Ligand binder design. Structure first.
Ligand SMILES: O=C(Nc1ccc2nc(CN3CCCCC3)[nH]c2c1)c1ccc(Cl)cc1
Length: 141
């Protein structure tokens, strides 16, 4: 009997692009998944898949190691499925987040947003427990 808790941070930055008036993309943005400082989520994260809007070239963006991030230009915000896959041999194998990638419209200052997620693993295998603790995970009885 034990629970191991680990922390993910999802976030994004967005700002106006300065290029020619005839390039349609108004914004640069960057979306990420990371650990808190001094945690190494690579120990328990196999890969992160960012599912961009269908209009993007190769919209299924895979990061198999850090940094887990996509840097793009665009003309609109959208809802981004973000899948974090685990180095786990049993369930759960992954978690899906629905990430609100919104841009700064109407001359508002840049977006710099963080969304903090706690993952709770009940009774993980010996092996996966060690990966979670190795990543800076916390046990509970
Ligand atoms: O912004 C949107 N679509 C889009 C489409 C194609 C794009 N190609 C780039 C430029 N990159 C190409 C690959 C290499 C790096 C540069 N940015 C794009 C953005 C979008 C967002 C939300 C809705 Cl609802 C609809 C459309």
């Amino acid at each position: 009997q034990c629970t191991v808790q680990v922390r993910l941070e999802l976030g994004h930055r967005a700002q106006l692009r300065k290029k020619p008036t005839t390039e349609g993309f108004t914004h640069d943005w960057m979306v990420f998944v990371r650990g808190p400082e001094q945690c190494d989520i690579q120990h328990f994260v196999e890969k992160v898949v960012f599912w961009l809007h269908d209009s993007f070239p190769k919209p299924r963006r895979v990061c198999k190691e850090p940094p887990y991030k996509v840097e793009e230009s665009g003309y609109a915000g959208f809802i981004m499925p973000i899948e974090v896959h685990f180095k786990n041999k049993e369930e759960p194998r992954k978690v899906c987040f629905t990430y609100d990638l919104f841009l700064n419209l109407e001359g508002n200052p840049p977006v710099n947003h963080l969304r903090c997620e706690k993952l709770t693993f009940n009774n993980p295998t010996t092996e996966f427990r060690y990966k979670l603790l190795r990543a800076g995970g916390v046990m509970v009885m």
